[PDB]
Each structure stands twice: as C-alpha cells, then as structure tokens.
Design a protein around this ligand. Sequence first.
Ligand code: 1YN
Ligand code: HEM
Length: 529
Amino acid sequence: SIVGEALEYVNIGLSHFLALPLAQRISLIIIIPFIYNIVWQLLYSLRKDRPPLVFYWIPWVGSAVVYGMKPYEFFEECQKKYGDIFSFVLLGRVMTVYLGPKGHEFVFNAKLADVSAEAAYAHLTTPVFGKGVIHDCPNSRLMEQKKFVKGALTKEAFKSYVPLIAEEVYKYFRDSKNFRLNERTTGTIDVMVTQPEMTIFTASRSLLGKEMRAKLDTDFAYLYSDLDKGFTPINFVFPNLPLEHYRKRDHAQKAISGTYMSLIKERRKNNDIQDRDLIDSLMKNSTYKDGVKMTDQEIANLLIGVLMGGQHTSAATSAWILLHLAERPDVQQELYEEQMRVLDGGKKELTYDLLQEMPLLNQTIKETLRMHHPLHSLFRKVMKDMHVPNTSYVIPAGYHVLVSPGYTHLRDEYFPNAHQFNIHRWNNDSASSYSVGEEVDYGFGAISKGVSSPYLPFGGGRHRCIGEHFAYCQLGVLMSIFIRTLKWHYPEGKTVPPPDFTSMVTLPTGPAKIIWEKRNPEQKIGGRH
Ligand SMILES: CC[C@@H](C)n1ncn(-c2ccc(N3CCN(c4ccc(OC[C@H]5CO[C@](Cn6cncn6)(c6ccc(Cl)cc6Cl)O5)cc4)CC3)cc2)c1=O
Ligand code: HEM
C-alpha cells in the first residue's frame, strides 16, 4: 500500500529531466509553454464569469499581429462569433473589448476608482513629453491641466487665431517647395508630407506664438522631427532602450522644453505677459487648487504634449479630407459655392464667426472624422474587479478594457452606408459634437454626462478631448483656403489609400499623392520671401 515509491520516481524524473540533451531541453522550454498555453485557454473557456477569449497559438504575443494590422476587421470577426464583449491577449496583456454604444458607456463613464488611463498610457507619452504632466501625474492633476489649457482655448482666442492660421497657410503656399503658387499653377504633392508641415506651422504660430514659430525656420525644426520620431506604439513595450532613436528623442525633449522655458523665464523677467498665446495663458493660470504651482519645466512639458497630440490627430485628418475630396469634384464644387456665398465672392476676410456660417465645410470635417477616427483603440487598465451589467461577466483587476468608437463609426446599423463618404448625412447637424442632454464637470468644464452616442470622435467622460474646437478652427481655416485657392484630383488610377493602423494615428498609407492646380493661375500671394 505504498505511494512512497511514486514520490521517489517524481524526484528521479525531475533529475532525469535536468540531464536531457540540450537539444531536447530547448525543445521542452518551447513545447511545454506552448502546450500549457492551449490547455489553459480551453480551461479558461469554461468560466462563465469571463467574456470569451479569442484563441491564439503563440504565447504572450497573442492576437497582436492581426489586431495591429486590421483592428476593425479583427473586431468584426470577433463580434460575429462572440457578440460585443470578448477578450484577447496582446503582447503580455489581456484586452477586454466592449463594442458599440454600451461599450462607450462601460469604459468612458467608468468610475475613477475602477479604471486608470494613466496606468495604460504613461509609458506611451511620458518619454516624449517629459515628467509631471498628462499621464505622468495623478488624475486630479490631469483634470486641472486640461482646465488650464482649455482656458487658452476660448471663442475670443479663436477669433485672433484665425487670421494667424490663415497667414501661415498662405505663406506655406507661397514658400513651400510643394507649392510655390507664385511660380507654379499646377503640381503634385504627397499629403503626408504637406499636412504634417502645415499643421505644425499653424499650431505653433497660434498656440506657441511667433517666437516659437520663428524657430521653425531654423535647424531647430530638426529637433521637432527627432521628438516626433519618439512618438510611436513601440513605446508601449520598449519605452526606453539604449539606442540612437531614443537618444535623439530625449535630447530633443530637453532641447525643446529648454527653448520654451527660456521664453517663459524671459517673459516673466520683462513682465511681458499678455494674452497672445497658450504660453502667456499658462504663465498666468497654472496654480493647482491645493496651492502648488506648475514648474516652468512642467509648463513646457505640457506645451509639448498639447502640441504633439494636436499635431498627429489634426495632420492625419486634413490628409484624409484632401484624399476624400480628390475623388469628389462635386463636393469641392459645393464647398466652393458656400465659400463664395459666405465670404462675398472673397471680398470678405475669413473670421472665426464666418467659419460658423459654413456648415458644409464643418460637415466635411465631421464626416472625415467619422470615417477616419485617428485613434482606433482607447485603453484603460482595470484597477478593481468590474461587473459587466446584464451579464455574468466580471473583468478582474489587471485586465485592460478597450473601447473603439471608430469601429462604431463604420457600422451600417448606426450610419447607413457607412463605407460611403457623405457630408450630407450631417445636414442640419454640423456641430463638432454636442451633449444630447444632461452635463457634468470633472474639473475642466461641463461636458456630456451620457457617452452613448454612436459618434464619439473626441471620446467622452473624464478623459474627453479638450482640443475639438481648436482642431475645427485649424482644419476650417486650412480647408477654407485650399478650396478657395485650388482644385485637386488623383493621378490616373489612384484612389483613397487604406489607413495605417500600426502608427499612433490612423494616418493614410503613403505615398498618397494628389495633383493640385490653381483656380486662379494669375493670383499672386504677397509678402517678402
Ligand atoms: C508587433 C506586431 C505588429 C503587427 N503590431 N502588433 C500590434 N500592433 C499595434 C497595436 C496597437 C497599436 N496602437 C495604435 C496607437 N494607439 C493609441 C495611440 C495613442 C493614444 O492616445 C490616447 C491618449 C494619449 O495620447 C493622446 C492622443 N491624443 C488625443 N488627442 C490628441 N492627441 C493625448 C492626450 C493628451 C495630450 Cl496633451 C497628448 C496626447 Cl498625445 O490621447 C491611444 C491609443 C494604441 C493602439 C499600434 C500597433 C502592431 O503594430
Ligand atoms: C482631430 C483632432 C482630435 C481628435 C479626433 C482627438 C481625439 C481625442 C480622444 C478620442 C481623446 C480621448 C482619449 C481617451 O479617452 O483615451 C482625446 C483626449 C485628449 N485630447 Fe484630443 N483629439 C484631437 C485633437 C486634439 C487637440 C488639437 C488637442 C489640444 C489642443 C487635444 C488634446 C487632448 C487632451 C488634453 C486630452 C485629454 C486626455 C486625458 O484626459 O486623459 N486633442 N482626444
């Protein structure tokens, strides 16, 4: 009646194991985690208190490759097999996806104690922006930082930004190799080259001021390029690794934040603090509610973050607008007529107020943001176990929740013929967004309380975007001028490119070229160059 001899043969087996040929021991260190992985998923599939988990062959990697290459195609397959809630493994992490408007509610209105955005995002952005701001600080600091920035983003600021943004667009048509409208009447451009330059020029001039704008004409512009490089999904797994890419980024962040602090300390020294730009504004208005002031280093890091966020979402969006309009001369024609009616055939300077009298222009932005949400996946790390309403599912702490309003933007159920670009689906509804009812303030102004809208380009809840009006202002001036100045179309046989879902924003797969030509070949842009 001896089990003792079994326990001996366990120990013997462990010892015979350790003495295997190194060819078999490498094999086992591969085959036994592979076998265990399959065994674990099958067992996992039994738990009725967990959403279904998408099956995967490679441990740790998970569904990373198919999710990254074509996330909306991934989501649609999963939705057919499992419905709206399902999980998948992604480079070590378990992501729980909740598709559709209830998904929006579940994640964007999640209680602050249940989930954390900074725990999800901190590695992605802190290396790039610097310490102390955005996701490298507690939520209540973030709430107030959004309040400070929003304070420079008022109707009266937009009124003064508009002629500044217009000036930069015109100087870019005049001076850029891509255009030179005083010398050339037609030409070819890559919109992934032109739009990121146009966006940084206009955002700099209006948010940072003319000094910082002036510096973009120098070799300082190269540091922006270097810091721009460090803004990549790979920071999610490799935020820091001793290589040259990471070294230029860190240098750039120091060099750029140094330049902003130089200006800040310069302005405080001369008492030269007005209401020109966002720098003036944060100098006057960056004291937290427990009395602590933001440092000059933190103020500068915040400027980098604001500028970098606006840079990528807006540049991609104007690239998409150009690309969709290039095959739709009917829409270009209709926008041109609205410009002629609102601006008296051009005998009226563009103002922020007149921009609000251009519904078709704003509907074009709205519709581009529907087809091309710059951020396909928004994340939160789960901090406490969460019950999913009307289900038996519990999402345990340590999981991530993923919400994807850009996926819902492309469903026929909520947008008839969702794959078709149509600015007229927004007729009599051209506002960037609006709360369908009740509102709430998390620290940075009253916003919509419900987040169930199928259309959520700026998200919702406490992490809701605050740059929506600035983006529309910027994109509006830009497109108003393109339309009044140029017609454009595709090279023969070219059409809208598919999105690049592996970058930070869903920008077009390039080279994405359009051919432009002047509406008025003899028109000249004045000023010195
Ligand atoms: C390894 C194999 C390969 C095939 N693969 N396998 C998987 N993937 C992959 C997966 C996921 C993703 N991403 C794309 C980027 N994405 C993402 C990027 C930025 C982001 O930002 C959310 C927060 C933080 O940044 C901002 C962005 N922003 C918002 N408005 C303007 N910018 C932000 C907020 C505030 C401020 Cl001040 C700045 C910034 Cl940047 O909001 C959220 C998600 C996550 C998924 C990419 C590739 C791959 O490429
Ligand atoms: C087309 C332009 C833009 C789009 C579509 C967009 C979209 C978004 C979205 C979806 C979020 C929420 C992210 C999340 O919930 O995880 C967000 C957050 C945010 N965005 Fe934007 N954005 C745009 C432009 C801008 C601009 C121009 C600025 C700055 C002026 C800006 C600043 C911010 C800030 C400060 C947050 C808050 C992040 C947080 O609270 O955690 N965005 N944006």
